[model samples]
Target: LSYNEFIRKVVSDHSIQEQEKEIRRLSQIVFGNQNQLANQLSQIHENPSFTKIISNTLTNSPESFAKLAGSKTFGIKNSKRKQAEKNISKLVEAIHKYADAVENSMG
Candidate 1:
Protein backbone atom coordinates (compact mmCIF):
# COMPACT_ATOMS: atom_id res chain seq x y z
CA LEU A 1 0.00 0.00 0.00
CA SER A 2 0.99 3.59 -0.47
CA TYR A 3 1.99 5.64 2.54
CA ASN A 4 -1.32 7.51 2.40
CA GLU A 5 -3.39 4.34 2.52
CA PHE A 6 -1.32 2.90 5.33
CA ILE A 7 -1.72 6.05 7.36
CA ARG A 8 -5.48 6.17 6.81
CA LYS A 9 -6.07 2.61 7.90
CA VAL A 10 -3.93 2.99 11.00
CA VAL A 11 -5.81 6.06 12.19
CA SER A 12 -9.22 4.73 11.26
CA ASP A 13 -8.67 1.57 13.25
CA HIS A 14 -7.37 3.34 16.37
CA SER A 15 -9.39 3.57 19.58
CA ILE A 16 -9.81 6.98 21.22
CA GLN A 17 -7.50 6.03 24.10
CA GLU A 18 -4.88 4.68 21.72
CA GLN A 19 -5.08 7.83 19.62
CA GLU A 20 -4.74 10.07 22.65
CA LYS A 21 -1.64 8.15 23.79
CA GLU A 22 -0.09 8.56 20.37
CA ILE A 23 -0.90 12.29 20.38
CA ARG A 24 0.91 12.79 23.67
CA ARG A 25 3.96 10.96 22.36
CA LEU A 26 4.06 12.98 19.15
CA SER A 27 3.33 16.30 20.87
CA GLN A 28 6.52 15.98 22.87
CA ILE A 29 8.51 15.55 19.68
CA VAL A 30 6.80 18.19 17.51
CA PHE A 31 5.62 21.17 19.53
CA GLY A 32 6.21 23.43 22.51
CA ASN A 33 6.28 27.12 23.45
CA GLN A 34 10.07 27.11 23.10
CA ASN A 35 12.11 24.30 21.58
CA GLN A 36 14.35 23.10 18.77
CA LEU A 37 11.51 21.13 17.25
CA ALA A 38 9.34 24.19 16.64
CA ASN A 39 12.34 26.19 15.47
CA GLN A 40 13.27 23.59 12.89
CA LEU A 41 9.75 23.60 11.47
CA SER A 42 9.87 27.37 11.14
CA GLN A 43 13.11 27.13 9.21
CA ILE A 44 11.70 24.54 6.86
CA HIS A 45 8.75 26.73 5.95
CA GLU A 46 10.88 29.80 5.41
CA ASN A 47 13.24 27.97 3.09
CA PRO A 48 11.12 25.28 1.57
CA SER A 49 12.95 22.25 0.24
CA PHE A 50 9.97 20.68 -1.46
CA THR A 51 6.84 21.78 -3.30
CA LYS A 52 4.60 18.81 -3.96
CA ILE A 53 4.67 17.86 -0.32
CA ILE A 54 3.43 21.31 0.58
CA SER A 55 0.72 21.23 -2.04
CA ASN A 56 -0.51 17.74 -1.33
CA THR A 57 -0.66 17.99 2.42
CA LEU A 58 -1.99 21.50 2.86
CA THR A 59 -4.09 21.75 -0.27
CA ASN A 60 -5.22 18.21 -1.02
CA SER A 61 -4.04 15.63 1.49
CA PRO A 62 -5.10 14.55 4.96
CA GLU A 63 -2.67 16.64 7.03
CA SER A 64 -5.03 16.86 10.01
CA PHE A 65 -5.06 13.10 10.07
CA ALA A 66 -1.33 12.78 9.43
CA LYS A 67 -0.56 14.78 12.56
CA LEU A 68 -1.75 11.88 14.66
CA ALA A 69 0.67 9.47 13.02
CA GLY A 70 3.96 10.88 14.32
CA SER A 71 6.44 13.72 14.24
CA LYS A 72 9.30 14.03 11.80
CA THR A 73 11.92 16.59 10.87
CA PHE A 74 11.60 17.89 7.36
CA GLY A 75 14.14 17.67 4.50
CA ILE A 76 16.11 14.97 6.32
CA LYS A 77 15.09 12.09 4.10
CA ASN A 78 16.15 13.01 0.56
CA SER A 79 13.53 10.71 -0.89
CA LYS A 80 10.80 12.39 1.10
CA ARG A 81 11.15 15.96 -0.07
CA LYS A 82 7.47 16.04 -0.82
CA GLN A 83 6.70 14.60 2.54
CA ALA A 84 8.84 17.29 4.13
CA GLU A 85 6.90 20.04 2.43
CA LYS A 86 3.65 18.51 3.51
CA ASN A 87 4.91 18.11 7.04
CA ILE A 88 6.07 21.69 7.35
CA SER A 89 2.90 23.04 5.82
CA LYS A 90 0.83 21.09 8.26
CA LEU A 91 2.73 22.56 11.19
CA VAL A 92 2.34 26.10 9.93
CA GLU A 93 -1.34 25.64 9.25
CA ALA A 94 -1.97 24.33 12.73
CA ILE A 95 -0.24 27.30 14.30
CA HIS A 96 -2.10 29.74 12.11
CA LYS A 97 -5.41 28.12 12.85
CA TYR A 98 -4.83 28.34 16.55
CA ALA A 99 -3.80 31.95 16.34
CA ASP A 100 -6.86 32.81 14.32
CA ALA A 101 -9.16 31.08 16.75
CA VAL A 102 -7.55 32.78 19.70
CA GLU A 103 -7.75 36.20 18.07
CA ASN A 104 -11.34 35.66 17.13
CA SER A 105 -12.29 34.64 20.64
CA MET A 106 -10.51 37.63 22.15
CA GLY A 107 -12.58 40.05 20.11
Candidate 2:
Protein backbone atom coordinates (compact mmCIF):
# COMPACT_ATOMS: atom_id res chain seq x y z
CA LEU A 1 0.00 0.00 0.00
CA SER A 2 1.00 3.66 -0.30
CA TYR A 3 2.49 5.56 2.67
CA ASN A 4 -0.60 7.56 3.53
CA GLU A 5 -2.77 4.47 3.29
CA PHE A 6 -0.39 2.60 5.58
CA ILE A 7 -0.44 5.40 8.12
CA ARG A 8 -4.20 5.72 7.97
CA LYS A 9 -4.66 2.00 8.55
CA VAL A 10 -2.17 1.98 11.38
CA VAL A 11 -3.79 4.91 13.11
CA SER A 12 -7.32 3.64 12.62
CA ASP A 13 -6.40 0.25 14.01
CA HIS A 14 -4.15 1.52 16.80
CA SER A 15 -1.16 -0.30 15.40
CA ILE A 16 1.24 2.20 16.95
CA GLN A 17 2.67 -0.27 19.48
CA GLU A 18 3.39 -2.84 16.80
CA GLN A 19 6.09 -0.41 15.80
CA GLU A 20 6.44 1.02 19.25
CA LYS A 21 10.20 1.20 19.28
CA GLU A 22 10.24 2.39 15.72
CA ILE A 23 7.62 5.00 16.54
CA ARG A 24 9.79 6.16 19.42
CA ARG A 25 12.84 6.10 17.20
CA LEU A 26 11.29 7.95 14.29
CA SER A 27 8.30 10.10 15.15
CA GLN A 28 9.70 12.58 12.63
CA ILE A 29 8.79 10.19 9.84
CA VAL A 30 5.15 10.38 10.87
CA PHE A 31 5.05 14.14 10.42
CA GLY A 32 1.54 15.54 10.41
CA ASN A 33 -0.72 18.36 11.43
CA GLN A 34 -1.89 18.58 15.05
CA ASN A 35 -5.28 16.97 14.35
CA GLN A 36 -3.74 13.99 12.63
CA LEU A 37 -1.31 13.46 15.45
CA ALA A 38 -4.13 13.66 17.93
CA ASN A 39 -6.15 11.00 16.15
CA GLN A 40 -3.12 8.73 16.02
CA LEU A 41 -2.61 9.12 19.75
CA SER A 42 -6.28 8.51 20.49
CA GLN A 43 -6.12 5.30 18.48
CA ILE A 44 -3.05 4.25 20.41
CA HIS A 45 -4.69 4.99 23.77
CA GLU A 46 -7.72 2.97 22.74
CA ASN A 47 -5.57 -0.01 21.82
CA PRO A 48 -5.79 -2.93 24.21
CA SER A 49 -2.36 -4.23 23.34
CA PHE A 50 -0.78 -0.84 23.92
CA THR A 51 -2.48 -0.47 27.29
CA LYS A 52 -1.43 -3.98 28.33
CA ILE A 53 2.16 -3.35 27.37
CA ILE A 54 2.17 -0.10 29.33
CA SER A 55 0.49 -1.67 32.36
CA ASN A 56 2.90 -4.58 32.46
CA THR A 57 5.87 -2.30 32.12
CA LEU A 58 4.54 -0.14 34.94
CA THR A 59 3.92 -3.01 37.35
CA ASN A 60 7.53 -4.05 37.73
CA SER A 61 8.99 -2.66 40.94
CA PRO A 62 12.36 -0.92 41.17
CA GLU A 63 13.82 -3.61 43.40
CA SER A 64 12.73 -6.20 40.88
CA PHE A 65 14.52 -4.40 38.07
CA ALA A 66 17.64 -3.90 40.13
CA LYS A 67 17.74 -7.57 40.94
CA LEU A 68 16.96 -8.43 37.35
CA ALA A 69 19.78 -6.14 36.30
CA GLY A 70 22.07 -7.83 38.82
CA SER A 71 22.75 -5.71 41.88
CA LYS A 72 26.51 -6.07 41.91
CA THR A 73 26.82 -4.91 38.34
CA PHE A 74 24.55 -1.85 38.55
CA GLY A 75 25.40 -1.08 42.19
CA ILE A 76 21.84 0.13 42.80
CA LYS A 77 21.38 -0.60 46.44
CA ASN A 78 18.21 -2.19 47.70
CA SER A 79 17.57 0.76 49.96
CA LYS A 80 17.20 3.07 46.97
CA ARG A 81 15.68 0.56 44.61
CA LYS A 82 12.04 1.10 45.51
CA GLN A 83 12.29 4.87 45.29
CA ALA A 84 14.15 4.69 42.03
CA GLU A 85 11.62 2.33 40.55
CA LYS A 86 8.74 4.50 41.67
CA ASN A 87 10.34 7.59 40.22
CA ILE A 88 11.14 5.91 36.94
CA SER A 89 7.67 4.40 36.55
CA LYS A 90 6.01 7.67 37.45
CA LEU A 91 8.11 9.63 35.02
CA VAL A 92 7.60 7.22 32.17
CA GLU A 93 3.88 6.93 32.81
CA ALA A 94 3.58 10.68 33.10
CA ILE A 95 5.28 11.18 29.78
CA HIS A 96 3.16 8.55 28.07
CA LYS A 97 -0.02 9.88 29.60
CA TYR A 98 0.94 13.40 28.64
CA ALA A 99 1.43 12.31 25.06
CA ASP A 100 -1.98 10.67 25.08
CA ALA A 101 -3.43 13.84 26.53
CA VAL A 102 -1.89 15.90 23.79
CA GLU A 103 -3.09 13.37 21.28
CA ASN A 104 -6.60 13.62 22.65
CA SER A 105 -6.44 17.36 22.44
CA MET A 106 -5.32 17.14 18.86
CA GLY A 107 -8.03 14.59 18.09
Against the true structure, candidate 1 has what lDDT? Answer: 0.40
**lDDT by residue for model 2 (1-107), tens:** 89987776667445334334333322322221112224444545565336445445435532332232112337544534344343444434543654454354344
Poorly placed runs, candidate 2 (over 4 Å): 1-49, 61-76
Model 1 C-alpha lDDT per residue in residues 1-107, reported as the tens digit of each score: 88987775565444323423443443333332123234433433354443235435444553443432334466343433444443454454544433333333333
Stretches of candidate 1 exceeding 4 Å from the true structure: 1-82
Best by TM-score: 2
Q: What value does the lDDT take at residue 76 in candidate 2? A: 44
Please give the range of 10 consecutive residues that has the lowest summed lDDT in model 2: 28-37
